[PDB]
Coordinates of C-alpha atoms in Angstrom, one line a residue:
Chain A
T1 CA 77.9 85.6 142.3
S2 CA 77.6 82.7 139.9
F3 CA 76.0 85.0 137.3
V4 CA 79.0 87.3 137.7
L5 CA 81.4 84.4 137.3
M6 CA 79.8 83.1 134.1
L7 CA 79.4 86.7 132.7
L8 CA 83.1 87.4 133.3
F9 CA 83.9 84.0 131.7
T10 CA 82.1 84.9 128.5
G11 CA 83.4 88.5 128.5
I12 CA 86.9 87.2 128.8
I13 CA 86.3 84.8 125.9
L14 CA 85.0 87.6 123.7
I15 CA 87.8 89.9 124.7
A16 CA 90.4 87.2 123.8
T17 CA 88.6 86.8 120.5
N18 CA 89.0 90.6 119.9
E19 CA 92.7 90.5 120.8
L20 CA 93.3 87.5 118.5
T21 CA 91.4 89.2 115.6
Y22 CA 93.2 92.5 116.4
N23 CA 96.6 91.4 115.1
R24 CA 95.7 91.1 111.4
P25 CA 98.4 92.9 109.4
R26 CA 98.1 95.7 106.8
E27 CA 100.1 96.2 103.6
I28 CA 101.4 99.3 101.9
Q29 CA 102.0 99.7 98.2
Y30 CA 104.1 102.4 96.7
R31 CA 102.6 104.7 94.0
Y32 CA 105.1 106.6 91.9
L33 CA 104.2 110.1 90.5
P34 CA 106.0 111.9 87.8
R35 CA 108.1 114.9 88.8
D36 CA 106.5 118.3 88.6
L37 CA 107.5 120.7 85.9
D38 CA 109.5 123.2 88.0
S39 CA 111.2 120.4 90.0
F40 CA 112.1 118.7 86.7
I41 CA 113.6 121.8 85.2
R42 CA 115.5 122.4 88.5
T43 CA 116.8 118.8 88.3
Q44 CA 117.6 118.9 84.5
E45 CA 121.2 118.5 83.6
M46 CA 122.8 121.5 81.9
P47 CA 123.8 120.9 78.3
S48 CA 127.3 121.9 79.2
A49 CA 127.5 118.5 81.0
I50 CA 125.2 116.3 79.0
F51 CA 127.2 116.4 75.8
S52 CA 130.4 118.2 76.6
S53 CA 132.3 115.3 74.9
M54 CA 131.5 116.7 71.5
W55 CA 134.8 118.7 71.7
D56 CA 136.6 116.4 74.2
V57 CA 139.4 115.4 71.8
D58 CA 138.2 113.8 68.5
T59 CA 137.0 110.5 67.1
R60 CA 139.4 109.9 64.3
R61 CA 142.5 110.3 66.5
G62 CA 143.3 109.4 70.1
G63 CA 144.6 111.5 73.0
Chain B
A1 CA 98.2 144.8 76.6
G2 CA 99.3 142.5 73.7
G3 CA 100.2 139.1 74.8
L4 CA 98.9 139.9 78.2
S5 CA 95.3 140.1 77.0
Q6 CA 95.5 136.6 75.6
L7 CA 97.5 135.3 78.5
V8 CA 95.0 136.6 81.1
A9 CA 91.7 135.8 79.5
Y10 CA 91.9 132.2 80.8
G11 CA 89.0 129.8 80.9
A12 CA 87.9 126.2 81.5
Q13 CA 88.6 125.1 78.0
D14 CA 92.2 125.9 78.7
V15 CA 92.6 123.7 81.7
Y16 CA 93.0 120.7 79.3
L17 CA 95.7 122.6 77.5
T18 CA 97.7 124.3 80.2
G19 CA 96.7 122.9 83.7
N20 CA 99.5 121.0 85.4
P21 CA 101.9 121.8 82.6
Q22 CA 104.1 118.8 81.8
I23 CA 106.2 120.5 79.2
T24 CA 108.0 123.8 78.5
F25 CA 108.4 124.9 74.9
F26 CA 110.9 127.6 75.6
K27 CA 113.6 125.4 77.2
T28 CA 114.3 122.2 75.5
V29 CA 115.8 118.9 76.4
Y30 CA 118.9 117.2 75.0
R31 CA 119.2 113.5 74.6
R32 CA 122.3 111.7 75.7
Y33 CA 124.9 112.2 72.9
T34 CA 128.1 110.3 71.9
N35 CA 130.9 112.0 69.9
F36 CA 131.0 111.2 66.2
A37 CA 133.2 111.8 63.3
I38 CA 132.5 111.1 59.6
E39 CA 135.0 110.3 56.8
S40 CA 134.3 109.7 53.1
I41 CA 136.6 107.5 51.2
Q42 CA 136.9 105.6 47.9
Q43 CA 136.6 101.8 47.6
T44 CA 138.4 99.6 45.2
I45 CA 136.4 98.2 42.3
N46 CA 137.2 94.7 41.4
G47 CA 136.5 94.2 37.7
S48 CA 136.3 96.2 34.5

C-alpha cells in the first residue's frame, strides 16, 4: 500500500512535469512564392486599361 | 513535322531552359505609362 502511495506520488510528479513542458508554443513563418506563369497571364492587366490615357484628352490642352 | 520535331524531342538539357517557365516571349508586358506631349520652340538669344 505504501509502495503504491509513493509510486503514485512520483508518477503524478512526472505527469505534472509532462503537462508543464507540454505547453511550449510553436511559431509559423510565411514564405512567399512567385505566381505561376499561367496564373500571372490570367491576372495580367489588359493593355486597353494599363495605358488607355494615351488618348484620354491631350497634354498641351485641358479638358 | 517541322516545328513539331524540335518541340517534341525534349531532353534533360532543356529542363534548365524550359522547365517551370517564368516568361512568355509571345505575349509581352507593358509598363505603367503616363501621357506625354512634346513641343519644340525657339529661345531668345541675349547678345550678338
